[PDB]
From a paper:
Here, we report the cryo-electron microscopy structure of the human m3C tRNA methyltransferase METTL6 in complex with seryl-tRNA synthetase (SerRS) and their common substrate tRNASer.
To determine whether tRNA binding to METTL6 induces conformational changes in the enzyme, we compared our structural model to the crystal structures of METTL6 bound to either SAM or SAH, but without an RNA ligand. The methyltransferase core of all models aligns well. Thus, while the core of METTL6 is rigid, parts of the m3C-RBD seem to be more ductile, to accommodate the tRNA.
Residue numbers in the entry: 29 to 55, 61 to 249, 255 to 271
The structure:
Amino acid sequence: VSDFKQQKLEQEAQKNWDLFYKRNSTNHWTTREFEELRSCREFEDQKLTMLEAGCGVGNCLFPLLEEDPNIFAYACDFSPRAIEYVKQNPLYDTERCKVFQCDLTKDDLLDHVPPESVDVVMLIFVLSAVHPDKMHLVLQNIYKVLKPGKSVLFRDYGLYDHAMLRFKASSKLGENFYVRQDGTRSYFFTDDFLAQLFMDTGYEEVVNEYVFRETVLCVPRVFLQSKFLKPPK
Ligand SMILES: Nc1ncnc2c1ncn2[C@@H]1O[C@H](CSCC[C@H](N)C(=O)O)[C@@H](O)[C@H]1O
């Protein structure tokens, strides 16, 4: 295990993510995200407001803004370089999306998104970054913004995913919890763990299924793919 370095890696979780956005090129969302995105819409062109948590460069989101022109995207990420990288992109349309630095385990989302304002939150490959101790914090932060009948679309690394089977016991922070070389972490989800996180934080399970996919020598990538709902009043 990494012992004290863990507290160091946690303390620097933003920085390594910020550094990751430094060195790397801008450079994944399945159709399920896009297809389920529209299923949250009752009127055929109902205007939907979506929070894409952990936006990164929003490489996946920005086409979705073009593909569907009648949705608003509150996008946040705690990497400042990440945000500017989306700020710099020409596709950025201040009308389409409000992007803002937020560490979801620290910053109340009501600073930028009105409470119960968003139709759908996308937790795509983000919860694996945050420390498992603090994950429910991300879920509490996003409950505040979810309309009381709306849902969270979650895709993330799942148990026994390729990356989990590639890591040496030296990258292992703990059970199903690993640090990538650049110091960003990957937690490899199990259906039960995510379910409890969502149950504890007040959501209701719609879909919680492992999804197996072919990496682009291939061992399947295992992604835990799920939909959770804010219970209605
Ligand atoms: N506590 C936190 N608050 C905000 N963003 C976080 C975070 N922990 C991790 N992240 C973000 O998690 C992301 C993992 S990759 C995100 C991009 C992905 N294509 C997507 O659609 O979500 C990084 O952009 C990182 O900055």
